[PDB]
Point group: C6
Chain length 222, copies 6
C-alpha cells in the first residue's frame, strides 16, 4: 500500500503477512461467496497493482476461476488501450510515460512507476484503483457463475419462519448479475410472490408499500 | 480511520485485518446481542464511511438484517436531505461540495471527499460520526427485533439466587426499545414486582429507596 | 488512549482490537477476581472516558454487576458536582467549559472535549484518571460482593502444606473490603491463629516478629 | 527490508517474526507448490540479500531442493561476473566498490554495503531484486521437478464436471517449464483436445474462438 | 516503557497487551522456574515502576509468593531510606523532589514523577531499573524456596547418558542461592564427584582441567 | 535492537514479545537442529549484547548445552583480551572506555555503553555483531555434538527414491564440523560413492561433472 495524508509523511509499504495470510484464509474457507469481494477490497485498501498481483497469485487451487479473472482483466486492458491511444514520441527527461493496459494490470510496470502514477506531478492516475475495479469486475463474474441457484427459486417453506426465508432470498440476491433497478423490482414483486400462503396473505394486508421491518414484525407470529 | 492529534501528524489509515477480522468473528459468533453494538463502535473509532461500508459489507449471512440496516440508513439519508436542501450552483474552485445523504452513507462519495469533509477548512463535517449514528440506529432496531423476549416476562424462579434473576432482567432490559425514563420506571417497579415471594418481601422491608448493592446484599442468604 | 512524551509528538489513538479483545476474554474467563482489576487498569493506561466506556459496554452478561458499577459511578458524579459547583456564565471564546460529573463519566462529553481537558492550556484536568478511579471503586465493590467467603474462615487443614494455606489466605485477603491497617492486623493475628496445630507451634517458636520467608522455611518439613 | 518513500524517512528494518514464521509455515505445509513462489516474493518485498539469505536458511528439510537452489544461484553469479568484469583498481575514498556475484547473493557483502548499493549516490544497484530474481529462477526449477505430472496427461473424466477438469489442467499448467507462447498454444489446443466426449462436442459447437466463461457456462449442464 | 534514543523522539508507552498477556501466561504455566526471571526482565525492558507494579499485580494465585515479594521490596525500600536521608525543605519551583523507597516501588509516586526521574535535568535517577533490581532479588528468593531439591543430591544414574545428568545438575544449579565462587567450586568438584562409576573414571582420566565439551565427548559412548 | 537508517531517526528498542516468544518456541520444539541457528540470527538482527543475553537466558532446559555456550563465549572473550590489551589510563571526559571481553558478552557493560559502542563518535565497535559471532560459534559446536550421526553412514536404501537419499545426506552435511573445501570434497565423492547400485551406475554414466538437477532428473525413474 501507499499510506495517505493531507499534510503527513507518505510511504510505500508492501502487503503485510497479517493481510496476506488473511486473504489466503478467506479464499481457502469461503470459496466464492459475495463477502469475499468486500474482504478483497478491504484488504486491498491503498494497494498498488503489485500488491494486487501479489494477492491474486498467492491463491492455490481455483485455477479455472483464477484464469477467468485473467481473461476479464485482459479485456479491460484492451478497452483501456483502445480509448487511450499510445503516442509515438520520446518520453523527454522530466516526464513520466503514459501507462497502457498491461502496466496498470501491473504486468508491464515497476513498483516505482506505479508509485509515480499515483503521486505524479499535478495529474494523478490511480492505477491501483483502476486495476482494482477490473479485478472486482472479474470477481463479480466468478461469484455469479459460482452462485448455486437462481433468485426465482427462492420459495418460503410451509413451516419456514419468515426471517429465514428473507435470509435465503437476499443471500441469493447478492450473487445475481442484475442492476439496481432489477433488484428493486425483484425485491417487491418476488419477495411477496414467493412467500408461503400463510404469510403471503398478511403482507398483502399491508398493501403495496411497507418496510421490511414492518413485514418481519408482521410475520413474527407464524 | 483518520488518527487524531492537537499538534501531531494526521493520517488516513484504512481498516486493519486485526480490526476487520475481529468484526467478522463478533458477528459470526454473537449474532445480534447488545454488546455487538459497542464492539462495532469500538472497532469503528475514527472511521470514515468507506471504513463503515467495509465493515458492514463483509458480513455474510444475516442478509434480512443487513437489508433492514440499508432501509434504515436510507431513511436517515432522506431526512438529512429534506433538512439540508441542495443548491443549484457551480462549486467554484477553492470550495468543496456540500455532502448529501448518499455521500455520507459513503455510496456517492470518494475517500478523498470523505477525508476532506472531516478536515475541511474552518467548518468541519464529521460524516463518519454522522453515518455511524445512522448505522447504530439500524442496529438498535435489529437488536430489538432479535430480542427473544419482553421485559415483563422476567420473573425470578422459586429457587433462583437473586443475583441470577438480576442478571436476566438487565440483560433483557438492554435489548428494549424504551427511553431512559421508561427504563428508570421499569427498574424500580418491575424489579421488585417480579422477584420471588421470599425476596419480594425483604426488598419491601428496605422501603422504596435502596441501592442495587443493598438489595443484592439483602437477598444474599436465600 | 493519548500517548505521552516530555518533548515528543502526542496522539489520540482509540482502543486497539488486541486491547479490546483481551479485556473481553479476561471478563469472559476470570469473572470477578481481583487480578481483573489490575488487568483493567493495565489495559486502560492513558485511556479517555470514551475508551473507558468502550471497555465497560463491551461486556456481555454480568448485567447485575455492570449495573452496580453504573450506580457507583453515578454516586461519584454526584459527589464531584456537589464540591464542584457549576457557574451560571457564558463560556467565552478562548475558554473550555468546566466538566461536570457526567462529562467525566464520558456520557455528557465529546472525545474532543475529553481530549482538551487532559491537554488544556495551563491547568490540566485528567478526566480519564478521575473516571478510572470511580470505575475501580465500583469494581472493588463488585469483587468484594463476589468474594465467595470471609477471611476468618481460612483454616489450615491437618495435612495441608503450609504453603497452600498461605496461598488461600492471601487470595481471600485480596478480596476483602478492609484498609491497610486492618490487613496488617489480620496478617499477624490471623495467619498464626488459623494455622494447623503442628505448625501453629513452630511459628510461636519464632516469637511475634518473623518474616513470611522465615515462616514458610520453618514449616517446610510438615 | 528497506521501506520506501518519494519524500519520507527511509529505514533499514530486518525481517519480522510474523514474516519469518509465515515463511517457515508455508514451506512446512505446502512443500513445493507454485503459490509458494508468489508467497516468497510477497514476504520478501523490499528485502536485501541478508533478508533473502535469512528466509532461505531457516528452512529445515528439503535439503536436496535447497542445494539445487544454491547451484542455480551460483550459476547466476558466474554469469553476472562474466558480463561484469571486475577492475584492478583501488576503491578511492568517496566511492563504493562494485558488487560481484557473491556480494549480491549476500555471501560476500555486509548489510551496510547491500544497504548502500540500493541507495548509492546517483547510480542505483538493486541487489535485493537481482538476487531475488536468481532465487525465483531456482525455485521455478524446483517447482518444475516437483510437479507430479505432465500437462498432456490432464484428461477430463467421464463423470467429471467440466469445472473440476479446468481446475486440474490449469493447476498443472502453472507448474510447467514452458513460455507464454507455449502456454497459449496448450490452452486452446489441449483444453478442448483433452475434454470428455460429451463436452468436447459442445466446445467444438462454439467454433475456435470463445472465452473460458462461455465454455464453462456452456458445459454447466453436464 | 520509555523508548530510548541518542537523538530520536523519546516516548512514554504503557505495557502492551502482547507483553502483559505473555507475562500472565509465563507465570500461569512455568510457576517458579529460573527462566521466568529472565522472561520478566525481558518483558520489563525500559519499564517504569507503574509498569512493574502492573506486571506483578496481574498474577492471580501464588499469593504466598507474591506476598514474600512485597516483604522483600519493603526491606529494599527501608535500606534505600536509611542511606538516602530525606530533607526537611520546600521543593522550590524549578526542582523535582527526591524519591523515597515507596516512590521507587511506585506506590507513592505518579507516572509523571517516575517519568521525570528517569529524564530529570542533568542528574538521572533510573527508578525503574532500581525497583526492577529489588523485584529480581525477591524473585530469586522465591525461585530458591521453590527449588524442589539441593544440588548435592544430583547423582548420575547407572544407565544415565552423561548428557542427561549434566542437564539435571545445571538445572538445579541455576536455582541455588550461592555466589559465583561457590558455583565454580561446585562445578568441578561435584560434577565429577557425583557422576556414575563408569564415567567418573574417564573424567578422572582427563586430569583436573578439561572443558565440558571434552567431558561430554569423552562420555558419549556410555 | 537498534533500528538502522542512512538519514532516518535511530532508536534503541528492546526485544519484542513476538520475537522473544518465537525464540522460546523454536528451542522448545526443534532442540538442536541447524535451522535453529539461522532462526537465532534472524531474530537477533540489530541486537545488542543485552538482547542476546536475554534470548539465551530465557531457554529452560538444555542446561548442559547452555553451559557449553558459556564456556565457548568465555574462550572468545579471553582471546579478545589477549589481542586487545587494556590500558592503565583514566578515561578522560569526552571519551568512552574501551570494551573488554566481558563487556562485549554483555556481562560487564550497560545498555547505554553497548548503545554507545555501536554509535561511538567516528570509530564504530559493533559489540552486538561480535558477540553474536561468539554465540553462533558455540551453537555450531553444540549442533555438531547433537548431530545424531556421521556423514559417512548416509547410504541410499535399495528401494530409496534418490530424492530422499539426497535429502538425508545434505541434512547430515549441514550438521558437520568441516570447512567448505571438505564439504565440496564430500559432495562429489561421497554422494555418488554412497548411492544405491541401480543409481550409482547412471550417475557414473554422466561422467564426473554434472549438476544436482541433472542427477535427480537422471534418477527420477527408479
Ligand atoms: Cl500471520
Ligand atoms: Cl505466480
Ligand atoms: Cl420472523
Ligand atoms: Cl442485494
Ligand atoms: Cl423478526
Ligand atoms: Cl488477522
Ligand atoms: Cl458488497
Ligand atoms: Cl444473590
Ligand atoms: Cl439497561
Ligand atoms: Cl451478591
Ligand atoms: Cl484481536
Ligand atoms: Cl451499550
Ligand atoms: Cl511449605
Ligand atoms: Cl492483600
Ligand atoms: Cl516453601
Ligand atoms: Cl510469530
Ligand atoms: Cl545456515
Ligand atoms: Cl462446470
Ligand atoms: Cl498458467
Ligand atoms: Cl461453472
Ligand atoms: Cl494479546
Ligand atoms: Cl491489585
Ligand atoms: Cl552424552
Ligand atoms: Cl548456573
Ligand atoms: Cl553429547
Ligand atoms: Cl506473543
Ligand atoms: Cl538467568
Ligand atoms: Cl528422485
Ligand atoms: Cl551443507
Ligand atoms: Cl526429482
Amino acid at each position: 500500500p501507499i499510506v495517505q495524508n493531507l499534510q503527513g509523511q507518505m510511504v510505500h509499504q508492501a502487503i503485510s503477512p497479517r493481510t496476506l495470510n488473511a486473504w489466503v484464509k478467506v479464499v481457502e474457507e469461503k470459496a466464492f461467496s459475495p463477502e469475499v469481494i468486500p474482504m478483497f477490497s478491504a484488504l486491498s485498501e491503498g494497494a498498488t497493482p503489485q500488491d494486487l498481483n501479489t494477492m491474486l497469485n498467492t491463491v492455490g487451487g481455483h485455477q479455472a476461476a483464477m484464469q477467468m479473472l485473467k481473461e476479464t482483466i485482459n479485456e479491460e486492458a484492451a478497452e483501456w488501450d483502445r480509448l487511450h491511444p499510445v503516442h509515438a514520441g520520446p518520453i523527454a527527461p522530466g516526464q513520466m510515460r503514459e501507462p497502457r493496459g498491461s502496466d496498470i494490470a501491473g504486468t508491464t510496470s515497476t513498483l516505482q512507476e506505479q508509485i509515480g502514477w499515483m503521486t505524479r506531478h499535478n495529474p494523478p492516475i490511480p492505477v491501483g484503483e483502476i486495476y482494482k475495479r477490473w479485478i472486482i469486475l472479474g470477481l463479480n463474474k466468478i461469484v455469479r457463475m459460482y452462485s448455486p441457484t437462481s433468485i426465482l427459486d427462492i420459495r418460503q417453506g410451509p413451516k419456514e419462519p419468515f426471517r429465514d426465508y428473507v435470509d435465503r432470498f437476499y443471500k441469493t440476491l447478492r450473487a445475481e448479475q442484475a442492476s439496481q433497478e432489477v433488484k428493486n423490482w425483484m425485491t417487491e414483486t418476488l419477495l411477496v410472490q414467493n412467500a408461503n400462503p400463510d404469510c403471503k396473505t398478511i403482507l398483502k394486508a399491508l398493501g403495496p408499500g411497507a418496510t421490511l421491518e414492518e413485514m418481519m414484525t408482521a410475520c413474527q407470529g407464524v
